[PDB]
Amino acid sequence: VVRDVAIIGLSGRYPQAKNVDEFWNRLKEGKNCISEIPKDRWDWQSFFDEEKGKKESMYTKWGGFIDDMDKFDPLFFQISPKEAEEMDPQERLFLQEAYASIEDAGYTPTTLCESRKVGVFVGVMNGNYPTGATYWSIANRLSYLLNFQGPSVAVDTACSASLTAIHFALESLYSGTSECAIAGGVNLIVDPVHYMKLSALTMLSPSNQCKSFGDQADGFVDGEGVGAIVLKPLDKAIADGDHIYGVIKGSMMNAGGKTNGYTVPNPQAQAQLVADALQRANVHARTVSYLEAHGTGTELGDPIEVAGLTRAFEKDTQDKQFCALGSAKSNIGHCESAAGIAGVTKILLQLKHAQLVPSLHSRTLNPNIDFTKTPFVVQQELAEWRRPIVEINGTTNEYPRIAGISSFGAGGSNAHVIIEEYIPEEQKQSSLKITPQNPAIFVLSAKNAERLYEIVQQLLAFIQEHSLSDEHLADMAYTLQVGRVAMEERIAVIAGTMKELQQKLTAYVKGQEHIADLYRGQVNRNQEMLDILTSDDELEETIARWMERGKYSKLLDLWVKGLSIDWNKLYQEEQPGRISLPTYPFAKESYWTHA
Amino acid sequence: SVVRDVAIIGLSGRYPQAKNVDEFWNRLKEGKNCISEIPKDRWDWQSFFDEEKGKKESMYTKWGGFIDDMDKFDPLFFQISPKEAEEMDPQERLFLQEAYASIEDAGYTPTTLCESRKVGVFVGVMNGNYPTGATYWSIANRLSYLLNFQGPSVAVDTACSASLTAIHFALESLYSGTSECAIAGGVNLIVDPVHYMKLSALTMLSPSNQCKSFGDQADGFVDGEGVGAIVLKPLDKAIADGDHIYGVIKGSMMNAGGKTNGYTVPNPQAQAQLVADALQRANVHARTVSYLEAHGTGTELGDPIEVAGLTRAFEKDTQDKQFCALGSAKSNIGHCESAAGIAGVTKILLQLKHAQLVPSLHSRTLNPNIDFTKTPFVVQQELAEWRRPIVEINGTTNEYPRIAGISSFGAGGSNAHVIIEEYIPEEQKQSSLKITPQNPAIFVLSAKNAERLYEIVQQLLAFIQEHSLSDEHLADMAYTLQVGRVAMEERIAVIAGTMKELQQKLTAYVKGQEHIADLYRGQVNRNQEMLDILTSDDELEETIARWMERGKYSKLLDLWVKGLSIDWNKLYQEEQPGRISLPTYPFAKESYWTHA
């Protein structure tokens, strides 16, 4: 039966946004990330022809392109350089983003699920790499390297592949086939044929603007993207103390069927799909305050889109101009398979910051659409997200910030998902208060010294722009203790306040060779030493005694050498909460194949 | 929702040296090897042929399972321009044709398949080497669009288990209520030498022409082509509708191997857990299983791990040995990858229908590394009737139906399993629809043009011959041809009270006979305004009802042949006949290809 499913992790790469934070900054500023075709992909002048519909040519020079496309760190995953050269960049990027999402969740593959029943569902539709289309490997490699014994399937459903993958993951969680799932999508542009095919049958706009729900709409703009989320039942997530971005209440998907031409959308199917999604989620349409439409900026698509949603909403309520409307495609373009995950990321960011971002190019609305006759009001300027107050069935009540996203493929496949915010219960005992009398333990590890240096710099910045304070010390320590893999190069710090942590990390960044309560070491040099020290049960008794009695200094002195420690026993009573911190700074090396 | 029985009501597929299921059964029964040389229309093998194994930009093989009429299509049937069909992937074309054939075999038409039109489509595919790019979603989206299916339409890529995973997803959708019917299947085609070059580079393909499953000297598998589909539907509803059921699916499960001592290395523990969970869901005791369609790729590493995993799974429940059969169709048709699961399902269904176990080729010399005496399985070697196992589960003798299972494992670690059980009809054979000269049947055949109708007549005559159909099948045949076939332009009808009379009249039609008793010809293209004026009157409806009830079949056919639309359901006021399998539409064969 249907039940609440929680989102506990998030990560993605989008045009002019190497992470979610930069993506939020771009959305907040109303920035257009559409740019020219980079020269490293191919030269556009040779293939550029203004005539529309011509074969073996394109009439566009813009698109959403992500930086560091061919960058990988194979040694992290124990992969030879030649293999990585033969691997599809989509597989590499999805692997990195999935690892980053698991890190953001405050979880490691060993502790993600003891049963190891973790599902993997990736949506992808383009395989233009010169070594052939191998979609299954994208998920199989992730399941193999991280040792996931659950479902690992790649889904191809056109522009709604990611959303359909999320739906399948939800179904697997409901059926008990899995306890956790990695759901996401990826879309990369690596061959001019990608643009040639689209230009031949004329869906791409000639300009650099995907004018969603605007006048003069003449198609969408291609873009690249990749992202993933970690799904988990709400009750279990609440018990574990992990942070929840949002809650998924329902999902549905169908096909348009027979229309007046292949690829022509069907409003009736969309209306039925949205109605069924609300039915499953048990959500009244009047309570929805935002809606992430497909919004490809197509003359034909947009009116049909709005009409379908209008009918679905009119099935329940007759009010008008009470819901918002927008799309991230106006910012980052149409990334196809990753469009659904990008919209989900936008919704989660809006919920976190409780704000509605502008929708570009909607200043002049489509004359063919009469929004006054519709519940929707296209967002135009940054505004705080109010909780809707409604009069459902003669009873006033304040409802949480609810949102929905609809993704529709070119082949008629359609999907929809309902997302609701999480309202934590007022349980803030804060018995884990960090003070100089109860100093915290901060541990950072990396494969080599350079990666650790970048980790330190990234953490310092993250503290700066997020304005973290002393109340986050316990959460930070717990996340860095039982949320990060313990690697070769290792260091630790003891701090009773945030400013002290700032000072010591800053000293480490500079060429300071001795710092108070700071330790350095490596595990490669210590195998037999760790073996002899671990041979004794005195090790276990000693570590327990020297944790309980307050001997943190020596505990770190040994942990840095290579000693393995279960930090859970350090918190006998209650448990801190995981939070989001910068992920591992994967090395950037160029690997490519010759056609 | 909760697990429940799901029935199979349709089947169709194309396999090497087998254009349909009947020829596939004939090949399996004869113990035939369908592996042959590479056809010259695909590419020349001598240029790329190098004996050295693992060499780049070359292959060390010249054999594979190839299906005939690969580039043949009938676009005008589906209202498709020739250029579009040229641009369409052959996998999409073949899957579309096979899905239509399966729906026809079910005794169903797209209009009447489901009134709600919630029909799911799940296709497993992993190779997209066509020169126009890999477009997998279109394979299912085109089928949903042409036939107007408003349910899920998704393409699945899970390596060698894509078809089985698609079947699992369709079952889950049926359980959740997202759909009432589903088209599940897979397809795998070889159209580019890169397909063989990649496999030869990392050395999985055997150099010989034999996929020696569970045999000595095993050194890999042999590539093959295949395509097939099935129609799924809840058992209770299918029983109510009277449709024929090939078998019943009790459970399905799928997982991944995880971390092993190398990428693509199988994990026995994951396979054992998968099989155990599948039996758990199906509520089937392992001792009751009498057949098992293993993956059986004929690999030195794979086979012992395969047998060990199944051995552990079975030992979880029972400790008996040498009581279950074992085999694979890959020894016959090779390893078709995405279509391997559907091919094995088809083999199991055919075995259940004919209640026989077919030989497993190249298993005469068993693998020395495997001690089958320590295992429940006994590899089948010769054709034998399928006994119902009599077992002593928990101190109670009972005779159980013929149960079977099939396991498909991908190269990336993905695994799948399905349990199939036979259907035992209840003894309800009132036969109140007996066909006699006093109650003659109505036989109607329609086609786009005259040639297709001619081939339909010939195919039906043959089908009667080799299946030895008799008078007791007349009602089922008439019902299937009435409410199971689309009513097309070229149309004819016949009135017959016995099978021999039908044979005589159809044979006369085949020959150049211009007048035959109780035989009518006509077309619908010439009759639009005539049908409009005749249908303008409610006298039409009253008249057709009167002239059905009162026995005026001759005039009813005289008008039906012209273009009149008739609902044959009212012709059977009491009870309802049962649908059966009859030859499908003979799609025209025209060559369409693209230039790279």
What do you see in this structure?
- Two copies of one chain form a homodimer.
- With 595 residues, chain A is an alpha+beta fold.
- Chain A contains 19 helices and 22 strands.
- The first copy, chain A, has a domain of 416 residues: 3-Layer(aba) Sandwich (Peroxisomal Thiolase, Chain A, domain 1), CATH 3.40.47.10.
- In chain A, the strands form seven sheets. A nine-stranded mixed beta sheet of chain A has the order 6-5-7-8-1-9-18-17-10, with helices on both faces. A three-stranded antiparallel beta sheet of chain A has the order 19-20-21, with helices on both faces. In chain A, strands 2-3 form a two-stranded antiparallel sheet.
- In chain A, a hairpin with a 6-residue loop joins β15 and β16.
- The two termini of chain A are 50 Å apart.
- Chains A and B meet through α6, β6, α7 and β9 of A and α6, β6, α7 and β9 of B.
